């Protein structure tokens, strides 16, 4: 009930019934939670 | 980009979530095109760099061209572009993946299509979705 | 210059298929040549793959304005 | 304690220099790097400097016409006579921006005097206790940048919104007080994101 | 945080209103996200971060904390019919 | 090479030609002309033994050791004594000046002179004279030369100034009519990132005399060309120096403290009372015998963006004083604005003849012109309040559209009253009240110095006409703009022709083709004007063609 009307509106902005922008892009990336999956960043841990 | 990820991830943990698996897609390209890594390949490194740049242009989250819009476009796909550049550096492409030019072009097209399919559809009620998906794990929680 | 995405959302797919199937059920003309089909749902899917449905989507932008899209203009996925 | 008093005063001055440097005011590098023994060398404090002597005046890099005082009170609770002295000195020097520390609290009548005389003399009370640490250097606080009106209108035109629709930041929260932004200002906040790298948001002051 | 030899970068709390008083709203957002991530990952269960980010942003959208209970939620500038749906309905319809 | 007794190619030729012993002479040459270290001599026959030429070894160590010379002069730049530094640098300078003619040893001399604030005059003379050397020398040499050679300094600023005037003319005549963007839109920092001002600041460094040369060039250009744009560059140069924080020039230029306020106002395009008081103090700080800076101040105030700032401040002051019921004579801040604008507008008079006395104001401007503006404004607001009051009977009285002509007399007799009236016209055009607009549109046809027909007000009117984009539906309004006002000076002044032509470019679709063709034939170039008006005419014909298809 608190988070009822929050919706990804065209231009891909997260907004409520009040039309106040909550997130400029959904999940900070505009990507749904379905297709995303685990990958590894190969350049983080190795030495110079 | 390595220094940037050191700033972003001081925990030094590589497991992240991203719209597409690039390693398995490289594997699929290898097996579709029957690439034998025991041979000297034919892939031009500058073609790899140019294709990566063009694909980076093709993947857009924030539309419009202005300083704020381009800055937001950079920020949105920052981590995914860093991951793509690290994985698809010409070094590893010509060293271990050994992918062919036609297979590489197919890989670029496939990554483009799958990224464009991964965009959050407008009209989605992410509010109720987050609410239910966060309420469900509460049903199974030991009380310490 | 329609700024919204050129893709058809799954919700737009659901609504356009349902509405066109109901139209076909109401003895509407079929803008594709059927092949012995009887269910309006299959005929609507055939038209969608043909990109031959006369509906125009009107996406209301949050600022009160809107964009208009032909179904054939959008990318069916 | 005298030793901890000078340690506290040195960290107070360091946090003030970092603050007004973050506000765009002209801060030299040495005072940004001033050490405890260096703080002693430029001047033991208790029954030896003064909260009136420790006061500083800083200029704005953008506008040399604008200067900001940072005052410290010699009394526990700032009294209306001290506010009168500070604002009269501001009148003599033709300044309107002044920051005033408080040792542990402020007289409520002085709070009323602050809010009443705000447009002619912009004053901000500030706890010594909250000033002891530069809160901006914490890991949880993201990077804040005050936006100016051309940026505000270009952003609003880029997204076709109003000020009502943006997320808010309460003006009484300590980060807005650190930046000294007023109602109607909007702050761009850059933060790291574990799914997009960087994320930019915009908080309207209220 | 004011005490000597106390790292004023990594020091933190599990309380929320403290962070609102001393740190700031975005710090409260981040600390809330970290606490929910900790209590969800305690049993080994994983949840996508975007849902947590959405909830933390909705709670911190007003520049001040908004509990999901009726005290926090009913203050929100929504339509009265949302208040019909929530609870304590007639108490809000009288003001409407 | 032979300056230091080193055998060059000519020595090789005279030892080769007329010599029946090439083998012996070449062997002795290769042995004697080796590198003077004993350890190499054991390895040079072995180095060559594989067919590997010693050439590649020579080239690699040539690059390495010359780079190390560059690194070591960079290191000694700020090492130890300045005396030891300049002694060793002058030694290497005189040594390699023999080899400055060489293409590979010239950068050594370049770096050495780059690390020298002052050099012997003969080396500077050879650098200047030989065109290849001057084109291949760094600006560190050129600053000293210009400190003793103002002619080449003028020669260098001249093309940059030409490009600056070209871009100024293009920007003032940039064919795009919109309220948002115009010639006055860019911020001062945006205009100070021009390559001309950055290059000039580098070419001056931190020397007062080069700054004085730039000053005198700007005086000559602004006076002889009668073009205010150079003055803007002067202010920009000063602020660029202020951006560089050179106390050698910030602390000597007394107008630096003035341009604090000028920058803080021109960015706002408004003079607040605080900066007004500051400007008053700076004017009052000018003592006797040093009044030349007033001329500089007037020059600095001749910047057209500053005229925009002062005129809009006067107009907005007069707009807000009606609510407080205060006359222009009862406005000391406004009187100070009038003083500063009067001192600014007479700038070219102060450079043409060294006038260090203030220009005088007009009583009737205080008592007739500005109260006539207020008269129009408050009649308009009284009509508006009557409209917002109900119960208006049939055939209501129109707003009085009669024009008091002493107002127009002051427009066409006082450049001060003229320009402030022009900015008032632009401001009411932003208010877009047709009644007062067509009330005052007569009388603007005759104005002082053709300022109503100059680049500034015409460009701003074209910018503001986008708000009136749909107001062209009435042919009466279009005739009032075109047949009434614009086309008076179009045949006789080139800029008015260009401005009316670009107005037709933007507003071609929102008029009937009859009126569009009428204004096209009225804006035919006179047979002797510039290429711009004819190209605009061709674009007019193209647009008239395209409209028939829509």
Coordinates of N, CA and C in Angstrom, one line a residue, chain B residues 4 8-9 17-18 62-64 66 68-69 71-72 75-79, chain D residues 147 151 154-155 158-159 190-200 202:
Chain B
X4 N 38.8 3.2 -11.6 CA 37.5 3.6 -11.3 C 36.8 2.4 -10.5
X8 N 35.0 2.3 -6.9 CA 33.6 1.9 -6.8 C 33.5 0.7 -5.8
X9 N 34.4 -0.3 -6.1 CA 34.3 -1.6 -5.3 C 35.6 -1.7 -4.4
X17 N 26.2 -8.1 -11.0 CA 25.0 -8.5 -11.8 C 25.0 -7.5 -13.0
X18 N 24.7 -8.1 -14.2 CA 24.8 -7.4 -15.5 C 23.8 -8.0 -16.5
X62 N 19.9 6.4 -21.8 CA 19.4 7.8 -21.7 C 19.5 8.3 -23.1
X63 N 18.3 8.6 -23.7 CA 18.2 9.2 -25.0 C 18.5 10.7 -25.0
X64 N 18.6 11.3 -26.2 CA 18.9 12.7 -26.4 C 20.4 12.9 -26.3
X66 N 22.9 15.9 -25.2 CA 23.3 17.1 -24.6 C 24.3 16.8 -23.5
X68 N 24.1 17.1 -20.1 CA 23.5 16.3 -19.1 C 23.0 14.9 -19.6
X69 N 22.4 14.9 -20.7 CA 21.9 13.6 -21.3 C 23.1 12.6 -21.5
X71 N 26.1 12.8 -20.2 CA 26.6 12.4 -18.9 C 25.8 11.3 -18.2
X72 N 24.5 11.4 -18.2 CA 23.6 10.4 -17.6 C 23.8 9.1 -18.4
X75 N 26.9 7.5 -17.3 CA 26.8 6.9 -15.9 C 26.0 5.7 -15.9
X76 N 24.9 5.6 -16.7 CA 24.0 4.5 -16.6 C 24.7 3.2 -17.0
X77 N 25.3 3.2 -18.2 CA 26.0 2.1 -18.7 C 27.5 2.0 -18.4
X78 N 27.9 2.8 -17.3 CA 29.3 2.8 -17.0 C 29.9 1.5 -16.7
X79 N 29.3 0.8 -15.7 CA 29.8 -0.5 -15.2 C 29.7 -1.6 -16.3
Chain D
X147 N 24.0 23.1 -7.2 CA 23.7 23.5 -8.5 C 23.2 25.0 -8.6
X151 N 21.7 25.6 -14.4 CA 21.7 24.1 -14.4 C 20.3 23.6 -14.0
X154 N 17.9 24.1 -17.1 CA 18.2 23.2 -18.2 C 17.9 21.8 -17.8
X155 N 18.1 21.4 -16.6 CA 17.6 20.0 -16.1 C 16.1 19.9 -16.2
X158 N 15.0 19.6 -19.6 CA 15.5 18.3 -20.2 C 14.5 17.2 -19.8
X159 N 13.9 17.3 -18.6 CA 12.9 16.3 -18.2 C 11.5 16.7 -18.1
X190 N 26.1 12.8 -6.6 CA 26.7 11.7 -7.3 C 27.1 10.7 -6.2
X191 N 26.7 9.4 -6.5 CA 27.0 8.3 -5.6 C 27.4 7.1 -6.4
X192 N 28.2 6.2 -5.8 CA 28.5 4.9 -6.5 C 27.3 4.0 -6.5
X193 N 27.2 3.2 -7.5 CA 26.1 2.2 -7.7 C 26.6 0.9 -8.0
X194 N 26.2 -0.2 -7.3 CA 26.7 -1.5 -7.5 C 26.0 -2.2 -8.7
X195 N 25.2 -1.5 -9.5 CA 24.5 -2.0 -10.7 C 24.7 -1.1 -11.9
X196 N 25.2 0.1 -11.8 CA 25.4 1.0 -12.9 C 26.7 1.8 -12.8
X197 N 27.5 1.6 -11.7 CA 28.7 2.3 -11.6 C 28.6 3.7 -10.8
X198 N 28.0 4.7 -11.5 CA 27.7 5.9 -10.9 C 26.2 6.2 -11.0
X199 N 25.6 6.9 -10.1 CA 24.3 7.4 -10.1 C 24.2 8.9 -9.7
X200 N 23.5 9.7 -10.5 CA 23.3 11.1 -10.2 C 21.8 11.3 -9.8
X202 N 19.1 14.4 -7.8 CA 18.9 15.9 -7.5 C 17.9 16.0 -6.4

